[PDB]
Write a protein that binds this ligand. Structure first.
Ligand SMILES: Nc1ccn([C@@H]2O[C@H](COP(=O)(O)OP(=O)(O)OP(=O)(O)O)[C@@H](O)[C@H]2O)c(=O)n1
Ligand SMILES: Nc1ccn([C@@H]2O[C@H](COP(=O)(O)OP(=O)(O)OP(=O)(O)O)[C@@H](O)[C@H]2O)c(=O)n1
Ligand SMILES: Nc1ccn([C@@H]2O[C@H](COP(=O)(O)OP(=O)(O)OP(=O)(O)O)[C@@H](O)[C@H]2O)c(=O)n1
Ligand SMILES: Nc1ccn([C@@H]2O[C@H](COP(=O)(O)OP(=O)(O)OP(=O)(O)O)[C@@H](O)[C@H]2O)c(=O)n1
Ligand SMILES: Nc1ccn([C@@H]2O[C@H](COP(=O)(O)OP(=O)(O)OP(=O)(O)O)[C@@H](O)[C@H]2O)c(=O)n1
Ligand SMILES: Nc1ccn([C@@H]2O[C@H](COP(=O)(O)OP(=O)(O)OP(=O)(O)O)[C@@H](O)[C@H]2O)c(=O)n1
Lengths: 535, 535, 535
């Protein structure tokens, strides 16, 4: 039988860039491995109502849920570590709260009461939090909700969320609410010692707003001496079980071992009185083997538009590497800047060194001819290609230009093109999960091993249905469509035209999990390994 | 069976002069009435090592324990409300802590370690606190120690005591430590409403140092509306059982009823899990009757040296009134300034209106001839007299001068007197409890109904043992002595010389309790009532 | 003409071990180079009244002023960087304040007033501070007093000093008081960026007690980007002239260049309106040349009792290196643990690799036979020796044992010795500066180039004046004495017995300055270089 849904807030002190996200994700992973139905939530502090306005080349990708809600990329780590789909409710922001309360004000639904910050805003936040305890579409209720509070304790940027957390702690009571806390432990080079004083000043600032931390996670470049853990337990009044060393791990997938080796999760389960059951590593030891024991290295070029910040492609890169792990191959990514590839001599100079090329999406970018040139090169050179979203549109433009439709373009990039092979259906902006059907015994059907698939979408332009028969003169099969056949979903060249050249409009990288890689990235790495073996 | 000795700290916020002392005393009274063995402690913040240096005309009397320890007058309220003797350990000060730790430093008992404030000072304070849990001379261990932290939360004056309280709360755990808190609720006259915001800012300041208050006592001139108690429970995270209204009571003896009518003590007993048993009021309803239903008013003049601050005589005045309550009489005190009474015309102008005159002590004052003049008048007029300590020395000087020893004096006030009837035995400064013996069937023996008594002392001058036979020529009997007869303890005139004129060297006001008045003050009020009846 | 003496407080935030001492010393150096008469003061937080109780093997040496006041070793850096003698007033501690105020309380000099912490303590601290503005023994008044506040801002350990600083800032006014501030800027390895948030939280904590910092010194492992200096000036309201980068310098003597290259001192002079004059580097460029361009490396063994903490010998090591700089030689110190040298085979195994051996002091240690063995070896091997204080007593014991006084000892280490060549005169504990006279044309007289010297002392045992003629049978000349000849001050072997073997009772390392090395350490390094050249 299930008790009340516990809440487990996480807040950062001293500094940002300490890994609250991956730490909370790893805690969710461990609780999942015990068999609890964990779910997760992020409370972003910024006022953007949704991230579709944000420049991804500075703030990373935009994740898309099943229900087509745009969310912070941080939600991706929670999905990947849980292997669970999360609702669009998983990402609250200050912008959603303030614009909700001001909308209800203008519509007059507060009966003319004065709209204070307290209680109206903090009750709305508390409601957005407690909604996660509601039963899912199957009627199951989660055991634990982990809620990463954004910003830093003491930021004016976060005070309303921490007042809401305080109120939740009042109404549910300490049997059912737990606070983790994450804080920096700097190393000083002239003296050669770890200093706890910033963590004491952090927990003092946290207590000044009425939250009591039940455990500390100490972020450090070396294992914290027991002689400092005891001092922290003295000066923070944190039970000495709950001062946890957490070095900088070798890789993000090692962090669950770090947290388990300090036995954090056993203390969490004991403190919340959740149904205690043994951890089974059998699902994750094999991952750590594949991660640490690569049989071979294989290089994939990724033809990004701008590549000085790699975080703009995080989930693409992680989906590639998750594919690599399926073949026990260390996928290494050659970050290739598309604007170097607009000339075939530059394309040859960049791309000739690799065993495959991948065309990632690029919603909202301008100027794609570099990607088309890179694809035309890769076809002539025989390099395997996968095109994610804009990737399919560049592949289709390349195919049409190969059959002489020289001025062919997307209506997005040349509204005056005489041959809009990609055109607006601004037309219906498709978002979220839609069904698709595969040509039976197509190459994609051979990969998925089924005719029925579903994918997450974020595009408003489509293959012009009048051109399908013309484009098929290239040999390009339209090997998947909408169930009515009205919309194009996949394209491929035949197996004897090229070994593997596929595109989709989807973002298949969003269905990646390291224990369950996406079929197309597995097949693409299989083709890249076969190219390595043949060359 | 007895569990661990619980601790119950009390700290003030917003302001001083809020009645932490009488509130904590009344809580001790209620817990005593349940039958728990309560004991109490004050942690003064000032650096005076003992108060014997302090000017009592600005800071009130100096209390004296059984073991002769000088303590703050605040200890008197705890003794009176408990009716229990307290050790000299009942009053810690910062001066005792800092001078102890620096003494152990100079004696080298820290093995050359650096003497920080933490942990050395706060461990010493914690030791001075936990000492109260040690078994008494009978081997009984108290159930509850109530510890009034001096100053205000947020004073630099108190930070080390609050860090010590935090450490105690860590080592004993919240099952065994409770915090009361006392805070002001101002009334604003232009708007006519109570404001809780100062109490919120107080509990925020208290939390900033890591103490969590379990209940609030709200100090207000009117009953706090339930609509503000709920807001305080919301904004302070104080369980709504534990927000307690406490109006300004009519008198200090009514405060136990106030605390019981809001049912504070039931919540304390439930929260500490003490052995629950019913309150019996039978001991205190009769006090409240006597306090509120006086049959008659009787006036006593008290011949103080300086009287603009009455707190210098607190325990004298309270012992008088406790005597009054024994005869159901409202004792009203005519505060008479001794320097008006040095001339017989001024003495007649001041003292003629009253039914008795009392000569209080005056350790460390200069110039006493006003008191001698007042006594000579009172004798001629027939007014009953009691002399406390210096009172006996003025009575004895008056007696000697009445038998012509005209230049007789105390060696304290004229070291060059040719007739030191009071002289140094600086000689042995007597402090604390000493036995004395009474002349059988003396007037004092008729009052005490026994030959054996004990009293608390604070004097270094004594009746000159060579003059006893000479002074007895006045008829003044030396009706009590040390058991060896070496020292004078009491004097009286015979019943047919005057109705009641007695002195002692003792401070009998320190053995006052309202449920157990001191015998001499009962007899003195009996004589003053008989004078009222006869006149 | 001279205006009022300015005050320049310095306080640390975020962490200790950030170099407030050397930073403030370097600021004093720069202001001295401009020609201002700077003086300095340390306000230690610990309650040790003087450090003579402290274990130096954990807290470093004890410095000794001209007037024989024991002070924290931190005073040594101020003396060395100023090249000025400082009074014993240069080191206040909480122990001196609290024991002073409690002494005046017990002596009754507060007229019975209650001794609060405020104002009595903080007025005493303010008085101890303002005393530094009083004219010196020549009647000159310093222009600037630099006052390093100990502990960290927000420590209960320091609150009274910061309240005193606030009061001084009130009474003198912001024209005449300046606050530096020192704060950490951590580097985070996973993200690769400097984080300013701990400095913002520091300056917030500092402002919460009413001090406004006029400049920030940022302590970092790399030059702070201008893009973070501007953010700090925004969020701290620090004038952007006054956010100063300070990397970890290569050596302590380079820090004046760091502070001058960021032009801190020009801003300080402009802000305090001191008499502006150009910096002259001519005194310090030659030091930095000698420091960075060593012609040769020469190794000196230092025979310490315990050597795992080198800070116990700080001023000895610095005096050696200052001697090295006089010959342009990199002195490298072989830290030799004396207990390895008690056997001649172990002595040979340790000491044979070096060009000289030095016997440092050791007040309060037990067991010296290792040092005697090391000296007997060094004599047989011909290694140059210098004995500081206990060094002379080991040299003298070795000399006496070489002439067959086999059971000779110091009365300190064998009170039952039949031959106390070193004996109590506990006798007079000599402290501070005393005159001494040198044998004309002695080797020491050839070094000092004068007959008259003075030295700082800290010993209570002396050469037994009855044994001088007996010990001189070794050839050991008693080449210096008290001016009356009563006390032994120096010993030497003749130039043809050994090249240079000298001892003293003094601590000559305390008169070291890098621009003015002590004559004996120059001569000793000259002899060690001559041994290197000959071997
Ligand atoms: N136990 C941890 C914690 C953090 N990191 C490193 O810290 C970086 C930060 O990644 P992230 O969790 O996403 O935090 P940020 O995006 O940088 O900033 P924020 O704290 O707001 O989440 C990661 O690259 C990760 O390698 C790590 O290796 N191990
Ligand atoms: N809440 C606190 C914490 C520390 N101190 C004082 O700060 C000094 C110690 O300085 P510091 O070394 O910098 O802090 P640590 O406790 O020792 O931890 P860390 O090593 O990280 O510095 C001690 O005198 C200690 O009493 C204090 O008064 N109040
Ligand atoms: N529930 C209360 C609390 C306080 N008082 C009044 O508050 C005054 C303060 O007396 P005391 O307890 O001794 O406090 P102070 O001496 O004035 O100052 P402090 O708080 O430091 O004890 C008393 O006269 C008392 O009448 C009261 O009548 N009822
Ligand atoms: N911790 C708090 C407490 C109050 N407020 C805000 O302060 C305003 C109320 O002002 P005020 O009346 O002065 O405080 P009250 O809560 O109403 O209590 P009181 O009547 O004593 O004033 C409200 O907007 C409330 O949201 C806040 O932002 N944060
Ligand atoms: N601008 C600076 C500041 C500090 N340090 C290094 O920091 C160390 C600290 O020395 P010190 O000034 O004496 O400080 P601590 O003794 O370690 O501790 P505290 O802050 O209390 O003085 C020194 O070894 C020094 O090399 C430095 O190289 N350059
Ligand atoms: N006094 C302040 C300081 C910062 N913030 C908020 O904190 C967030 C920035 O987080 P962070 O990067 O960690 O602090 P920085 O100012 O950017 O400095 P640093 O790089 O060291 O982190 C911003 O939303 C900013 O508005 C705030 O609300 N109040």
């Amino acid at each position: 039988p299930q008790t009340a849904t516990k809440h487990l807030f996480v807040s950062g002190g001293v500094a940002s860039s300490l890994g609250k996200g991956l730490t909370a994700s790893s805690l969710g992973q461990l609780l999942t491995a015990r068999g609890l139905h964990v779910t997760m939530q992020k409370l972003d502090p910024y006022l953007n109502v949704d991230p579709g306005t944000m420049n991804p080349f500075q703030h990373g990708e935009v994740f898309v849920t099943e229900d087509g809600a745009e969310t912070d990329l941080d939600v991706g780590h929670y999905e990947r570590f849980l292997d669970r789909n999360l609702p669009g409710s998983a990402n609250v922001t200050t912008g959603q709260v303030y614009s909700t309360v001001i909308a209800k004000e203008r519509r007059g639904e507060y009966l003319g009461d004065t709209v204070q910050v307290i209680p109206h805003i903090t009750d709305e936040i508390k409601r957005r939090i407690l909604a996660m305890a509601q039963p899912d579409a199957d009627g199951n209720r989660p055991d634990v909700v982990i809620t990463e509070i954004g910003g830093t304790v003491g930021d004016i940027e976060s005070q309303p969320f921490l007042e809401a957390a305080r109120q939740v702690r009042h109404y549910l009571g300490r049997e059912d609410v737990f606070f983790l806390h994450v804080s920096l432990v700097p190393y000083l080079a002239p003296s050669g010692e770890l200093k706890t004083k910033p963590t004491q000043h952090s927990v003092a600032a946290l207590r000044s707003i009425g939250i009591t931390p039940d455990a500390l996670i100490l972020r450090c470049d070396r294992d914290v001496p027991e002689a400092l853990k005891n001092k922290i337990a003295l000066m923070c009044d944190v039970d000495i079980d709950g001062v946890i060393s957490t070095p900088d791990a070798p890789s993000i997938y090692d962090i669950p071992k770090v947290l388990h080796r300090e036995e954090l999760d056993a203390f969490v389960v004991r403190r919340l009185n959740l149904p205690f059951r043994d951890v089974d590593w059998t699902e994750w030891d094999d991952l750590l083997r594949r991660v640490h024991e690569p049989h071979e290295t294989v290089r994939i070029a990724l033809v990004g538009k701008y590549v000085e910040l790699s975080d703009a492609y995080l989930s693409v890169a992680e989906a590639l590497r998750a594919g690599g792990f399926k073949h026990r191959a260390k996928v290494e990514i050659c970050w290739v800047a598309s604007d170097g590839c607009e000339t075939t001599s530059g394309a040859a100079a960049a791309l000739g060194d690799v065993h495959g090329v991948l065309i990632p999406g690029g919603f909202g970018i301008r100027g794609i001819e570099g990607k088309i040139g890179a694809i035309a090169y890769a076809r002539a050179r025989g390099l395997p290609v996968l095109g994610l979203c804009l990737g399919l549109q560049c592949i289709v433009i390349e195919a049409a230009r190969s059959v002489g439709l020289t001025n062919a373009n997307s209506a997005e990039f040349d509204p005056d093109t005489p041959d809009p092979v990609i055109a607006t259906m601004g037309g219906t902006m498709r978002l979220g999960s839609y069904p698709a059907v595969l040509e039976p015994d197509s190459v994609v059907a051979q990969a998925y091993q089924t005719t029925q698939v579903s994918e997450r979408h974020r595009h408003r332009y489509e293959v012009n249905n009048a051109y399908r028969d013309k484009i098929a003169e290239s040999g390009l099969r339209f090997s998947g469509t909408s169930p009515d056949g009205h919309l194009v979903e996949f394209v491929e060249y035949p197996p004897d035209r090229h070994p593997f050249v596929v595109g989709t409009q989807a973002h298949p990288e969003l269905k990646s999990r390291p224990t369950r890689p996406h079929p197309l990235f597995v097949a693409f790495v299989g083709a890249a390994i076969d190219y390595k073996a043949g060359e």
